[PDB]
Amino acid sequence: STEIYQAGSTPCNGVEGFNCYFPLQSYGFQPTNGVGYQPYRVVVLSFEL
Amino acid sequence: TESIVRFPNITNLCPFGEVFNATRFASVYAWNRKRISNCVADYSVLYNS
């Protein structure tokens, strides 16, 4: 879902603005970025028993 | 059957602005300290900003 977050008055009408922000933010990865900020692929295996 | 909670009838809002909006901060080796108590603190803004 991409509902606009409510940080202010109840009505938002799905329009970005003051106290109305998108719930998804894009990452930023560049070859010159540090190891801490560098991207990492994570795979999590869960076994069912 | 029901949930009740009580607190002092009249209370003052905590002055988070004076420390969060301090015009100038101190150095790391001289980090600034400020005590707060006996005042209502609204922690919602902390994660709502």
From Swiss-Prot, chain A:
Annotated stretches, region: Disordered: 1-22
Variant or mutagenesis effect after changing residue 15 to A: Increased resistance to neutralizing antibodies
Outcome following mutation: residue 33 to Y: In strain: Alpha/B.1.1.7, Beta/B.1.351, Gamma/P.1, Theta/P.3, Mu/B.1.621, 19B/501Y, Omicron/BA.1, Omicron/BA.2, Omicron/BA.2.12.1, Omicron/BA.2.75, Omicron/BA.4, Omicron/BA.5, Omicron/BQ.1.1, Omicron/XBB.1.5, Omicron/EG.5.1; May enhance affinity to human ACE2 receptor
Disulfide-bonded cysteines: 12-20
Effect of residue 28 to S: In strain: Omicron/BA.1
Annotated effect of mutating residue 7 to V: Increased resistance to neutralizing antibodies
Effect of substituting residue 9 to N: In strain: 20A.EU2, Iota/B.1.526, Omicron/BA.1, Omicron/BA.2, Omicron/BA.2.12.1, Omicron/BA.2.75, Omicron/BA.4, Omicron/BA.5, Omicron/BQ.1.1, Omicron/XBB.1.5, Omicron/EG.5.1
Effect on the protein of changing residue 33 to Y: Increased binding affinity to human ACE2
Function, in words: Attaches the virion to the cell membrane by interacting with host receptor, initiating the infection. The major receptor is host ACE2. When S2/S2' has been cleaved, binding to the receptor triggers direct fusion at the cell membrane. When S2/S2' has not been cleaved, binding to the receptor results in internalization of the virus by endocytosis using host TFRC and GRM2 and leading to fusion of the virion membrane with the host endosomal membrane. Alternatively, may use NRP1/NRP2 and integrin as entry receptors.
Assembly: Binds to host ACE2. RBD also interacts with the N-linked glycan on 'Asn-90' of ACE2. Cleavage of S generates a polybasic C-terminal sequence on S1 that binds to host Neuropilin-1 (NRP1) and Neuropilin-2 (NRP2) receptors. Interacts with host integrin alpha-5/beta-1 (ITGA5:ITGB1) and with ACE2 in complex with integrin alpha-5/beta-1 (ITGA5:ITGB1). May interact via cytoplasmic c-terminus with M protein. May interact (via N-terminus) with host bilirubin and biliverdin, thereby preventing antibody binding to the SARS-CoV-2 spike NTD via an allosteric mechanism.
Protein name: Spike protein S1
Organism this protein belongs to: Severe acute respiratory syndrome coronavirus 2
Annotated gene: S
Residues of the full protein shown: 469 to 517 of 1273
UniProtKB/Swiss-Prot annotation, chain B:
Effect of residue 21 to Q: Reduced viral infectivity
Effect of residue 17 to H: In strain: Omicron/BA.2.75, Omicron/XBB.1.5, Omicron/EG.5.1
Effect upon mutating residue 9 to Q: Reduced viral infectivity
SS bond partners: 14-39
Disordered, as annotated region: 1-13
Effect upon mutating residue 24 to T: In strain: Omicron/BQ.1.1, Omicron/XBB.1.5, Omicron/EG.5.1
Domain of life: Viruses
Residues that carry a glycan: 1, 3, 9, 21
Functional summary from the UniProt entry: Attaches the virion to the cell membrane by interacting with host receptor, initiating the infection. The major receptor is host ACE2. When S2/S2' has been cleaved, binding to the receptor triggers direct fusion at the cell membrane. When S2/S2' has not been cleaved, binding to the receptor results in internalization of the virus by endocytosis using host TFRC and GRM2 and leading to fusion of the virion membrane with the host endosomal membrane. Alternatively, may use NRP1/NRP2 and integrin as entry receptors.
Quaternary structure annotation from Swiss-Prot or TrEMBL: Binds to host ACE2. RBD also interacts with the N-linked glycan on 'Asn-90' of ACE2. Cleavage of S generates a polybasic C-terminal sequence on S1 that binds to host Neuropilin-1 (NRP1) and Neuropilin-2 (NRP2) receptors. Interacts with host integrin alpha-5/beta-1 (ITGA5:ITGB1) and with ACE2 in complex with integrin alpha-5/beta-1 (ITGA5:ITGB1). May interact via cytoplasmic c-terminus with M protein. May interact (via N-terminus) with host bilirubin and biliverdin, thereby preventing antibody binding to the SARS-CoV-2 spike NTD via an allosteric mechanism.
Name this polypeptide is given: Spike protein S1
Source organism per UniProt: Severe acute respiratory syndrome coronavirus 2
